[PDB]
């Protein structure tokens, strides 16, 4: 009968406590026997916890806690001295707080809070055979960082009775050592949950509470308010072990479930619009900003780049407080670009991304370069531009989005030669929303888009690929600000597109404007978009121009990249494309040119036309170019790829890279043979011992390092 005696004892302990009968405690030791007579159960926990939760409220009324006795200490001892029950009550408490958080009473809460404090007093209570937790301290965060997200109206009515009990138990001594009785974390969530829920104590800057009135209180809006004004507390949450800060606030507001909250969506945004301003007017000793605004955006981005890491969340957690935060970050960005002393420097907000990409140099182009966009979009299309104000002239330019977009194009693996569209519209839509500030709003654009074409090609080629979805925006904007003719750099593009969409129909001619690699993009993308074959592209073209070949090279490049994309999707070859290219080559082989310098993954001697192309291509792809160089080289003549200049110096320098990938096993044969037969009837460098050496082992370098000397 391990139960009957249990209830008999925990009942005899009921009346014996109404009066502090001296030394009437050994009846505690008795229960030990009972517990020793019982060691699935999950009831000993509740049986032993209700004794406390009921004897407290039963004695209270006869006397206040301080003048109550030495009872709870001995109870906690007789409980903890058997390190198996102490491994259960914790579990039942955490189990009933979370799941049935609302299905609780107003008299069981305090019964757990006081027990929690009493636990904190017996720090020697430390068990190690409890998976998930190591020490006691961890338990507090473990349960509270789950309560303050699922249900907030129970982390306040549980972190208030604890204080109202501590300030009635130990409120006899401890002028200074008081701090150390309560657990620290309790005394922080208050500082974050009280104002939020009730406004009467937002910004405003006695003996004791009403003698433990909680047992027959009239509410919680006055028991949480009769305690926030207590001059003994407001002079207590200033030490370091009770100091809430700015980042540690975002980390908790980002985790509130929109649903299960208690505030309407049009009331939990005033709280943020106030707090974000209360933490910007502070000192850094506390952790808050010193009155600036830079440190108010750096510190909101450095948290979003830290809360997503634990939410990989493949393709569910309810709508987090996230998003809202990013709306209180643009209401603040419109206050440092719209001003009269701009001095428009933006080196910051980008060096913040140069760090996360160096922690692991969840790859870069998987889950971090998709937040450097979700952020960079929610902003206005003006922040991407500098807007200097040297002497009121207020010229235009950009040097921190180019130097950066040249290292985030590695994101879009779909195409490889292009950015996405949604990050190319903001730019062109910004240079139009910034010229306004200038005097002649149609003489800066001509300057920006002319400095471009030489510093950030990768942005135009993503326009060319999207023109028919973009023109009716720029036009309707320049015709909505002021009805004046377009500039000479958002117009040339319309002409170069119309000189295409017509001549593809029924055939007339092509105009061949100055820069090749833009006309070629227009042409190729239009073909692809109209589903035409690859035979019109090659007949509607000049034959006597000095700017013909430089179009065909560029046309071969996109074909290569499309092959490579088709390989990274249900790996195969897509035979048809391998034909187009060879035609292209034959369309330029009776002119005496050199197409083999796209396959130089360096910058040694490539004429200026490649750099402006390779500096637009991702690096996920140029690591594969060899996977495409040994498919369309053998599909050519065995002799029309040798009259060139320095051929094999690319061939074998590329085979050196075809191996690192292994460590198409069926393609190893074709590479081993085609990069083995040319080496006889090749350039006049060597006549033997080079094919032998190549057959020896993977020592092409050990001999080439000396062979390339003479050649």
């Amino acid at each position: 009968e391990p139960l009957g005696i249990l209830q008999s004892a925990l009942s005899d302990l009921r009346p014996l406590v109404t009066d502090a009968n001296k030394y009437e405690d050994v009846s505690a030791q008795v229960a030990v026997i009972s517990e020793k007579l019982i060691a699935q159960e999950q009831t000993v926990a509740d049986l032993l916890l209700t004794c406390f939760c009921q004897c407290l409220i039963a004695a209270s009324g006869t006397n206040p806690p301080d003048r109550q006795g030495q009872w709870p200490t001995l109870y906690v001892k007789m409980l903890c001295g058997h390190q198996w029950a102490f491994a259960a009550v914790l579990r039942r408490m955490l189990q009933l707080l979370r799941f049935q958080a609302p299905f609780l009473k107003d008299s069981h809460i305090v019964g757990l809070a006081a027990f929690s404090i009493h636990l904190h007093e017996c720090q020697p209570s430390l068990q190690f055979l409890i998976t998930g937790v190591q020490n006691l301290e961890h338990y507090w965060e473990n349960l509270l960082n789950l309560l303050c997200s699922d249900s907030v109206g129970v982390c306040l009515k549980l972190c208030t009775a604890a204080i109202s009990y501590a300030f009635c138990r130990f409120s006899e001594l401890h002028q200074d050592i008081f701090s150390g009785c309560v657990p620290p974390l309790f005394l922080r969530k208050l500082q974050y949950l009280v104002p939020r829920l009730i406004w009467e104590t937002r910004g405003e800057v006695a003996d004791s509470p009403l003698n433990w009135n909680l047992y027959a209180l009239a509410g919680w809006k006055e028991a949480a308010l009769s305690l926030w004004n207590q001059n003994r507390l407001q002079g207590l949450l200033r030490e370091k072990s009770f100091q809430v800060t700015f980042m540690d606030w975002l980390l908790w507001e980002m985790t509130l479930k929109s649903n299960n909250d208690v505030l309407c969506d049009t009331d939990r945004q005033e709280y943020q619009r106030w707090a974000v301003n209360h933490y910007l007017s502070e000192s850094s000793v506390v952790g808050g900003c010193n009155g600036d605004l830079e440190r108010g955006c750096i510190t909101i981005a450095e948290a979003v780049l830290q809360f997503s890491n634990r939410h990989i969340q493949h393709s569910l957690k309810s709508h987090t407080g996230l998003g809202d935060i990013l709306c209180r970050l643009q209401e603040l960005i419109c206050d440092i670009v719209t001003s009269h002393h701009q001095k428009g420097r933006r080196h910051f907000f980008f060096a913040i991304f140069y760090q996360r990409l160096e922690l692991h140099k969840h790859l870069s182009k998987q889950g971090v370069l998709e937040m450097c966009c979700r952020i960079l979009l929610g902003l206005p299309p003006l922040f991407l531009i500098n807007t200097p104000s040297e002497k009121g002239i207020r010229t235009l330019g950009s040097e921190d989005f180019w130097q950066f977009v040249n290292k985030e194009l590695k994101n879009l693996g779909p195409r490889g030669y292009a950015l996405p569209y949604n990050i190319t519209a903001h730019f062109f839509r910004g240079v139009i929303s910034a010229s306004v500030q200038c005097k002649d709003s149609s003489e800066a654009v001509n300057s920006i888009l002319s400095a471009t074409y030489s510093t950030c090609p990768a942005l135009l080629i993503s326009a060319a690929v999207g023109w028919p979805q973009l023109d009716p925006v720029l036009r309707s904007q320049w015709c909505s600000l002021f009805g004046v003719d377009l500039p000479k750099e958002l117009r040339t593009l319309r002409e170069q597109q119309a000189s295409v969409d017509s001549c593809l129909s029924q055939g007339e001619k092509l105009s061949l404007s100055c820069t090749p690699w833009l006309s070629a993009a227009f042409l190729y993308s239009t073909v692809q978009r109209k589903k035409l074959p690859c035979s019109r592209m090659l007949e509607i073209l000049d034959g006597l121009s000095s700017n013909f070949s430089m179009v065909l090279i560029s046309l071969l490049f996109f074909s290569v990249m499309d092959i490579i994309y088709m390989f990274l999707k249900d790996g195969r070859k897509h035979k048809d494309l391998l034909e187009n290219c060879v035609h292209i080559i034959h369309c330029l082989e009776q002119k005496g040119e050199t197409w083999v310098w796209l396959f130089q993954m360096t910058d040694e001697r490539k004429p200026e036309l490649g750099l402006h192309l390779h500096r637009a291509a991702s690096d996920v792809f140029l690591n594969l170019m060899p996977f495409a160089f040994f498919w369309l080289v053998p599909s050519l003549q065995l002799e029309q790829v040798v009259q060139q200049q320095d051929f094999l110096v690319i061939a074998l320098d590329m085979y050196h890279k075809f191996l690192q990938l292994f460590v198409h096993h069926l393609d190893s044969h074709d590479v081993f043979t085609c990069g083995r037969q040319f080496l006889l009837c090749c350039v006049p460098k060597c006549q033997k011992p080079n094919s032998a050496i190549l057959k020896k082992m993977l020592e092409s370098w050990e001999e080439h390092d000396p062979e390339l000397a003479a050649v």
Copy 2:
């Protein structure tokens, strides 16, 4: 027919911000031939069991019962529920055999012999909750078996002369064809997330075959129309709860219709499949299945060939719906008008899809949209779309948000977050040619349809749309859209708009009457604070606005005064965050007045007066009314000898006769503050008169300045209700209300007219005899015995128009 729609509207109003409506309470006493036997039983006839183990609507009933509103008949409500519980306290084998004898027949010999077996099915089905929930899953299930049995011998092209026949047989009955529908509803709502992968294809082929028969189902619980009003309910509920199933299904009622119903000219084929399946596969595919949006490539190797009927030996659901979106005959069929998808239907689908149900992470659910919006924003207008007019975009989004209502919600937040991404590109441009006027217009035209005053059905919709008009403005703030600066080398910061909207159709929004709520009156201040950066001074641009605001749009200031204490630290912190210098000269006089009032109340120091007698008497009133102090400690501290005193004593009478009402509409009968007014009157008498009738006159004939600077802040719900108060309080005075007043009789009649034009009452309609007294002793213009016998009828004008000409 009507009262039920009214109950629905009231409930929809009692959930987003729920205490009680206002028009119903006004009508309880005015309209009380129609509040009993036409609206109460309308709310008590629904007496269903408490289906939810809680109070879902009985909240409103209990709240009304807290008052005298519902009569003792309330008891019969409870006694009725019990009675309902007294009402609800509570072969097939050979059918399975026959219905199962079919499968062997249909392998090769389906040569018109599958008829007599149908005759037997129908002959035994004649004789047959469990009676229905069991037979449905017995008829239907036979499909999923017979189909799969015949789909191994030959494809559907050649076979398939039984299915139409079996369905023809089923529809031949009436009490069973109406069970399969609800059974499929339940079987695709609850058990849908996990039932099977071949119990589906046996439902697409039962959906289609129910289309080529065009049966009649005019009688049903909900679906009254033909099928076309049934597919949409199903598909909408489903795509709102379960997405993957919607696509798994839509892409199986198609693949079964390019194989079957093939080999026929392309002009009539498009009538076999319903329209909505395509009208929804044009939307789902590019949402879930990326790689088909228009970014990567158009891969095509099998474009012109009947795609293989492989769903029974397939590999997955990512090649049965992508080997279909690439078939030319379809991709060239999604261009007709019978099924388009336009930029006002995409929203009403995407703006009702609650997270916790979708299959996408947040940072992909927030890229899909940004792709869509930027695809219906570069599309012609003959098709659904807007060429490049960001204005038109925002207009459409706002119109949809307004036409979605007919709190906490997740989908709507995303739309309201894209509004900001669109707008913030405007305020940072300073159009000066297309300005905020393009936006507010929408409201004005959504708010004119409800002018045909009716039986408490449109007012509710009016305030319901108004609350959303407000919620929006709080959902597209960069926080200074509501500010109209200019440019002539400098910036003036003026705001000529949002003042008309407030003076016309916003002040009649919230409680307390004369004020607004403290969620929209902070945006104006937190916006002048944030737009005062562009200028060069930043301390005078604010004083200019706040000095102009005294003449026009005064209803804002008062809403600050009434709500100051929870507004001071906000600004005191914002300013220090931005500049970090002293405050201006017009944002601190308010603080000084508040502090003076406070410091004077505790002890008493003959409060001063800041020459603005409709501000300095709002502080004084609210500070009292919140701390529950009485009158005597309210006007015992005024120092009126010759300064502006009577005005500070009339503003209080206004504020005290506009809160006798907020304590009437809000579950009450009468409040005891009229004594405060009977005292203010005795204080205005001791002075040299200072008459008080300006307030009780609606025209603008001779009302002095403040007399029309006040009514320009009230609401038309109250000003239409003053006579009530005028006739409540009057009887507490006599022999001085007239003989020493000016224009009393005229006003009394002007009021007694509207006291009759309200309704189509001993405590309500009693001043009949009262107004039948003032005449015998009044300012005698003619007033001999005619108005004593002429106002004794229904014509207060048959002779008054002339009896006033003799004055």
